[PDB]
Design a protein around this ligand. Structure first.
Ligand SMILES: Cc1cn([C@H]2C[C@H](OP(=O)(O)O)[C@@H](COP(=O)(O)O)O2)c(=O)[nH]c1=O
Ligand SMILES: [Ca+2]
Length: 129
């Protein structure tokens, strides 16, 4: 896989963000994770986490996997990097997202995220408390 540029347009919630990609506004849905909705427990914390991570970044990148690049709602499906640090992974590592939505052919970073989730669970963080 490879990283490609994007710029933040606006925070949305824990696992979706509006980015400009190839010069077009898109909503991106983060691969292989599920954050709580804003109205749910740890939703506001997940939203804040993802907002901060994108807003503080000098450089945002997206990395598409080998399969589907947009979902049925027109959202881009990607791994999102803030100054080289994967947002998807960080969410999981902090207990603010579960590994989820693992479809065959877009699951390159599955095991990386599962390892993170295991560490979050061991530390009893957030969703795992
Ligand atoms: C993460 C992801 C979600 N989706 C779809 C499945 C779910 O369909 P349904 O809306 O029918 O439940 C939905 C979950 O996203 P959200 O967690 O953003 O709701 O997005 C994909 O198709 N591919 C993906 O990789
Ligand atoms: Ca969600």
């Amino acid at each position: 896989l490879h990283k490609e540029p994007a710029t933040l347009i606006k925070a949305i919630d824990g696992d979706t963000v509006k980015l400009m990609y190839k010069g077009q506004p898109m909503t991106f849905r983060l691969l292989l994770v599920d954050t709580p909705e804003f109205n749910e427990k740890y939703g506001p914390e997940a939203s804040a986490f993802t907002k901060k991570m994108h807003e503080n970044a000098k450089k945002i990148e997206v990395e598409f996997d080998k399969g589907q690049r947009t979902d049925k709602y027109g959202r881009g499906l990607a791994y999102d990097y803030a100054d080289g640090k994967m947002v998807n992974e960080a969410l999981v590592r902090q207990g603010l997202a579960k590994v989820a939505y693992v479809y065959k052919g877009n699951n390159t970073h599955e095991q990386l995220l599962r390892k993170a989730e295991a560490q979050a669970k061991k530390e009893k963080l957030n969703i795992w408390s």
